[PDB]
Every structure is written in C-alpha cells, then in structure tokens.
Amino acid sequence: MISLIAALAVDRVIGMMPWNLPADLAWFKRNTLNKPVIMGRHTWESIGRPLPGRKNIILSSQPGTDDRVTWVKSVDEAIAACGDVPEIMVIGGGRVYEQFLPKAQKLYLTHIDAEVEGDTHFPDYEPDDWESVFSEFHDADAQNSHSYCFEILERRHHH
C-alpha cells in the first residue's frame, strides 16, 4: 500500500525550512522507519544523504550516479523496486506527490500554522474522499518554532 507523508504550511505550501519543528521530524522518522521511501531528485539533493533504516528510492528520468540509493525512472518502476512490503512511503516533492496521490490509500499530514513565501504546493485532494482517523494539535515551544497539527487520513473514495 502507498502512503504520502508531507508537512504543509498555509495554502498547502511545502518546502525542502521556514519552520523549525524537531517534533515533526520525529513524527516523520517514526512513520517512515523500516519502510521504503520514494522521493524525486530535487528532494534527494536537498536531503543529501540516505535516510537511515529505510530503502531510499529516487524517481528521476535522469538518474544521478550515487550508488547509495536506488534510481528508478517511473512510478511503476519505483513501486516494483519496493517489492512485497506492507507500506511504501512517498516523501515528495510536489510533482512526485501529484503523480502518486491516485495510487495512495493513506496520508500523513502535518498542518503547520505558518504563512510562508514558497511556490511548491502539495496536490489537491478531495476531502470528501478521505476520512480523518487521527488528529493531534501541538503548541509551539522552546524547541518548535510554530504550532502544528498531525493528521492521518485513510482513503474512502476514488475518482
């Protein structure tokens, strides 16, 4: 099964960080550890080093040479490279989320209370097609710059 995981500012702006949220990074790690992660080449270059404890699959029509990750050229190849696993995590960026959304059955979202200047957005999804099965709000604190709300949604309908 395919899931997307993303952190969204107001207006669904995503980035590679205008905010400083170690709690969100802990949420990201907890929910991706021991699962393959699929990302586009822009996201890969922004991370710079393979995420530990996860198979790192990079979707790009023009692969790099880095032997530390697995390079694939299509959504279908990305999925095949993951093989028989319970859950595949798609970690962005904008275009990769857009291509994978139709195949996804679960969303892990962090809704951040920040207005920011970026131009890359998380895909449009029809809220009526999803059910909110978890939500938790957290205030900002000495370690986290903004307030945020974790949410998990499960797909109920497809169009």
Ligand SMILES: Nc1nc2c(c(=O)[nH]1)N[C@@H](CNc1ccc(C(=O)N[C@@H](CCC(=O)O)C(=O)O)cc1)CN2
């Ligand atoms: N919800 C959430 N989802 C996301 C991101 C986020 O920002 N938060 N960011 C996007 C991908 N970018 C990164 C950049 C850095 C890291 C990263 O470095 N993670 C460490 C944890 C951080 C650390 O302890 O050093 C890890 O092992 O997972 C993860 C995703 C995609 N999805």
Ligand SMILES: [Cl-]
């Ligand atoms: Cl957590």
Ligand SMILES: [Cl-]
């Ligand atoms: Cl990308």
Ligand SMILES: [Cl-]
């Ligand atoms: Cl505090």
Ligand SMILES: [Mg+2]
């Ligand atoms: Mg090689």
Ligand SMILES: [Mg+2]
């Ligand atoms: Mg889009």
Ligand SMILES: [Mg+2]
């Ligand atoms: Mg769309």
Ligand SMILES: [Mg+2]
């Ligand atoms: Mg319904």
